[PDB]
Amino acid sequence: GLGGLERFCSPGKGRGLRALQPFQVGDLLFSCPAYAYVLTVNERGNHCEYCFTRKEGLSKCGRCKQAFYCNVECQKEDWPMHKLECSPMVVFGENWNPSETVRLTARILAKQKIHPERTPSEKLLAVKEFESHLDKLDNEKKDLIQSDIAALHHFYSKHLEFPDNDSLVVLFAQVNCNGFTIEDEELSHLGSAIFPDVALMNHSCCPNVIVTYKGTLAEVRAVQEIKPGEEVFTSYIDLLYPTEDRNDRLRDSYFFTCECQECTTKDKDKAKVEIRKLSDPPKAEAIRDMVRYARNVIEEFRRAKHYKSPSELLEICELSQEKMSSVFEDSNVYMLHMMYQAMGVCLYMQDWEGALQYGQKIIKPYSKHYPLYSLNVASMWLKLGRLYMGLEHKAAGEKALKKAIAIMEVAHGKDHPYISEIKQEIESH
C-alpha cells in the first residue's frame, strides 16, 4: 500500500482511493510505473520503444527495422515484450495490423507469464482484480471483443499460451474499462498502457487530481486541496461538454452515470451552450434542434477525416460553424469543437497561420469552460505559443508559453522534462 493514501469502498462507486494525509495544489500524490505499455505505430522512430524518450537519432532494431531505442540497454530491456512482434512484423509483412488494444492485451498476457507475482504497479489494485462490466456489454461490444480475440490469436500465437475464450473476453473487457492512453505536452497520442493503482481512482467532472506521464511513468497531482478522508477523483472524459454529453460518454465507455457537483447542479450547462442574444430571441425548440445538428456534425467529422481531403474537412468545419452561428454564440462548446477540428487540419497541413487564427479564436472561451488546471487548456496555450514563436511573434509566444508553464507546473510538476524544453524555447527566442 501507498503512503498517505488508502484503497476503500466508495458507496455507489465500487472501490476508490481515499486520502489519509492532506495534499496541496501541485502536490505529487503517487507515481505508478506502467505494468504493460506500447508505443503507437505512427510514433515509431520519434520515441524510444522502452522508456518513451522523445530524442533525435534513435537506434533501429536490426531484425524488424520497426522498433527504435536510446541504446542497446533499452533494446535488451524491451526484448521480452518486443519479441511478441519482432519476427511477426517481418513474417506477416503488411498483413501485420493488430489494433493497439490487441497489442496491449498481448503484453498483459506476456507480463502475466513472466511475472505472475504482484508488481510495484499493483500496490493497491491488481490487474486480475480489475472491473470488467462483462454482464453490462451489448452485442456491438461483445462482437468487437470477438474480433479482437480473433486478431490476438492470429498475430500473437507463437509465445503465448491462451486461456479459454471466457477468460479472453473478461480480459478484453478489463482493458477497455481500465486502459490508459499516453499523450504528450500537445495532447498528442503516444501509446497505450496499464497503470493498476491509477485505475483505482473514480471519476468526477470536477476532479481533485490530474494524471500526467513522465516517459511510461504515470504521475498523479492535486489540482484542488485534498483533506484526510476525502476521496481522490480524476476525470475520465473531456470536461468541455455539457452534462448530458459528458454522461453519454461515461455510460458508453464506463457504464455509469456521474452524480458529481457539476452533474447534480448542471450550473455550467447554460454557459456551455451559449445562445446568440438576438433582437428576436431563438425558440426553445430551435435550440434543441441546433444541439441535435451540433452533436451530429461532430460524429460526421469523426468519420469524414478517414475518407475526405484536408480542404474538404475545413469546408465541413466552416459550413457547420456558419449554420450554428445563427442560433449559437462563438463561445458555445459546439462552435469551439468545430474550431478545434479546423485548427487540427491546419496544423496537419503545416499551415501555421491558419492554425494560429483558429487558436486565437478558441483560447479565451476554452479557458473559462475547463477547470482551473486543465491539460486541454495548457496544450492550447502551448500550441498558440509555439505558432507565435514560429511565425516570429516573440512577445505573444513568450506570453502563451508562460501561461502553458503556469498550468503545467501544477499538473506535471516544476521539474518536468516538458517544462524544461518550453523554458528552453523562450530563451532561444
What residues line the site for ligand SAM (CB under 6 A)?
13-16, 131, 177-178, 199-200, 202-203, 254-256, 258
Burial of residue 201 (CB within 10 Å: 0-12, 13-18, 19+) is: buried
State the residue for C-alpha cell 511477426.
88
- The one-character DSSP state at 162 is -
Q: Between residues 143 and 300, which has the closer beta carbon with respect to Na ion?
A: 300
Specify the stretch interacting with Zn ion by CB under 5 A; choose among 73-81, 177-185, 216-224, 368-376.
Answer: 73-81
Q: Which of the residues 11 through 50 are near ligand 6TL (CB under 6 A)?
A: none
Q: 51 is in the binding site of which of Zn ion, ligand 6TL, ligand SAM, none (Cβ under 5 to 8 A by kind)?
A: Zn ion
Joined grid coordinates for residue 192: 497505450
Which one among 137, 175, 211, 263 touches Zn ion, defined by CB under 5 A?
263
Contact 182, 37 (CB under 8 A): yes
Distance of closest approach, residue 215 Cβ to ligand 6TL, in angstroms: 16
- Does 39 bind Zn ion (CB under 5 A)? Our answer is no
Q: Considering only residues 360-399, where is the footprint of ligand 6TL by CB under 6 A?
A: none
Between residues 221 and 386, which has the closer beta carbon with respect to Na ion?
A: 386
Per CB under 5 A, the list member of 144, 177, 217, 260 interacting with Zn ion is: 260
Find which of Na ion, Zn ion, ligand 6TL, none residue 258 binds, CB within 5 to 8 Å per kind: Zn ion
> Quick one: which of 7, 15, 54, 141 contacts ligand 6TL (CB under 6 A)?
141
Q: Count other C-beta atoms under 10 Å from residue 311's C-beta.
A: 9
Q: Map residue 156 onto helix, strand or coil.
A: coil
61 binds Zn ion (CB under 5 A): yes
Residue numbers 249-288 binding ligand 6TL by CB under 6 A? 253
Q: Which does 200 bind (CB under 5 to 8 A by kind): ligand SAM, Na ion, ligand 6TL, none?
A: ligand SAM
At 100, give phi and psi (nearest 5°).
Answer: -55, -35
| Secondary structure in 3-state letters for 59-114 | EECCCCCCCEECCHHHHHHHHHHHCCCHHHHHHCCCCCCCCHHHHHHHHHHHHHHH
135-155: buried (b, 16+ CB within 10 Å) or exposed (e) per residue? eebeeebeebbeebbebbeeb
The CA distance from 48 to 69, in Å, is 4
Which residues are CB-contacts of 12 (< 8 A; sequence separation ≥ 6)? 259
Spatial CB neighbours of 366, under 8 Å, sequence gap ≥ 6: 240, 336, 376, 377, 380
* Annotated binding residue 256: yes
Single residue of 32, 39, 124, 145 touching ligand 6TL by CB under 6 A: 145
Cell numbers 522502452: residue? 50
> Which contiguous run of DSSP H or E holds residue 194?
strand 189-194
Nearer to ligand SAM, 15 or 361 (CB): 15
Which of 173, 222, 400, 407 touches ligand 6TL by CB under 6 A? 173
**DSSP structural state of residue 1:** -
CB of residue 388 to Na ion, shortest distance in Å: 11
Contact string 224-243 vs ligand 6TL (x = CB under 6 A)? ------------x-------
Q: Residue 198, interface with Zn ion (CB under 5 A)?
A: no
Summarize the annotated binding site for Zn(2+) as residue ranges.
48, 51, 61, 64, 70, 74, 82, 86
Residue ranges that bind Zn ion, judged by CB under 5 A: 48, 50-51, 53, 61, 63-64, 67, 70, 74, 86, 205, 258, 260, 262-263
